Amino acid sequence: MEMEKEFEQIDKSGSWAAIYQDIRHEASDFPSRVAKLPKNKNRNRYRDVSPFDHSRIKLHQEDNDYINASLIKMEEAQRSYILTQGPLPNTVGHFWEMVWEQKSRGVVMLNRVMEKGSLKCAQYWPQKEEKEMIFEDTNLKLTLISEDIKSYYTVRQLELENLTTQETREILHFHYTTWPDFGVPESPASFLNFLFKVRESGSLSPEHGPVVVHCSAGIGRSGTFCLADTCLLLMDKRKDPSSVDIKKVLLEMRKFRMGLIQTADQLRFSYLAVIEGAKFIMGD
Ligand SMILES: OCc1ccc(-n2cnc3ccccc32)cc1
Known part of the structure; x- marks a missing residue:
């Protein structure tokens, strides 16, 4: 579906929590073994927020190369972000x-x-x-x-x-x-x-x-920022801007860091931001 009318359909039906729980169920699960090593306990703020091994940023150090940070690489939009x-x-x-x-x-x-x-x-x-x-x-x-x-x-x-x-x-x-x-x-x-x-x-x-x-934690407000930026860029690049599917973009970003968008209210706010932003980019 398009975005602005999918939006009103979720508001009228009051199903934001169900939409958000679907995203949580479908999200990727990859290992984060380096984050959980005992020597890194005081390098993590929250025990349930860790970078995946495959996308973590490595420090250029031979003693301990670990930081709680992930590279989010968006191929079609041609944008990259480090979330930490x-x-x-x-x-x-x-x-x-x-x-x-x-x-x-x-x-x-x-x-x-x-x-x-x-x-x-x-x-x-x-x-x-x-x-x-x-x-x-x-x-x-x-x-x-x-x-x-x-x-x-x-x-x-x-x-x-x-x-x-x-x-x-x-x-x-x-x-x-x-x-x-x-x-x-x-x-x-x-x-x-x-x-x-x-x-x-x-x-x-x-x-x-x-x-x-x-x-x-580097997943909630931070996820809202990069999700809105990438969706707006895709709407400028594509022949059909109504083809941009914010739930699909969010699931792509969750291949690179767990937990992006922490609440159903943050999900609704992300929709609102992309909808209003798309009008300013042009002329309405
Ligand atoms: O790059 C910002 C930007 C570009 C295009 C558009 N846009 C134009 N027609 C549209 C129809 C549906 C959805 C988005 C649409 C919005 C925002």
Whole structure:
């Protein structure tokens, strides 16, 4: 079926939970043996969210190459994304090592450091120009260059230096600051505006390594971001945009990381975002 009318048909019939449970039943199951080794317990935030072995990002280290991060490679859309958990106190150096080694231009953050009165990820970037951060375990230096605070999101320019070679690179930090502590946003307008700002920066384009996107577990809000982006790109590429099937795209992405889209409300929000976004791309 088309999307917008499949949407109204699920709303009127109140069957979002049944649709979402079908997706969970059909989703791929691949091994995640490296994630579960005892030496990696303090490298995982949640015991039930792990990268598959076949798609995990490897650190370029011989001691321990493990990080909780996955490469999502979308062949028809010609887009790739790295989805990862929010960094832990003992993985902030690994996180920036990955950004460096994978040649990423942008980092997309979809959570606040504290939500619901608890810490959802480490404070992993510097907050003042004159107070830079040094990660001694991976030999990197990170400096805040500039910060632009808007009503729904903040964009930061960062300098990452590999202290071993003295090479430097400019990284863009795109921080969506207004996702509610409970539920999903009422309108997708600010989330779509944010997605378009990431696109306009070059961070999603083939002349760079994959964008790094995270929330707390790296599967819920993070899954919503890449699902909406890929569906909109396919609607631009195909002769028949109504052929794009958001459930089929989500199941393809779940071949590369488990659990993408965590609730039926996140599934409905993803439909809403793609529907509204497809009107702005053209003229309605
Ligand atoms: O790239 C954004 C983009 C491109 C095309 C379209 N689009 C045009 N006609 C359509 C019919 C059905 C569904 C989507 C449609 C939307 C969004």
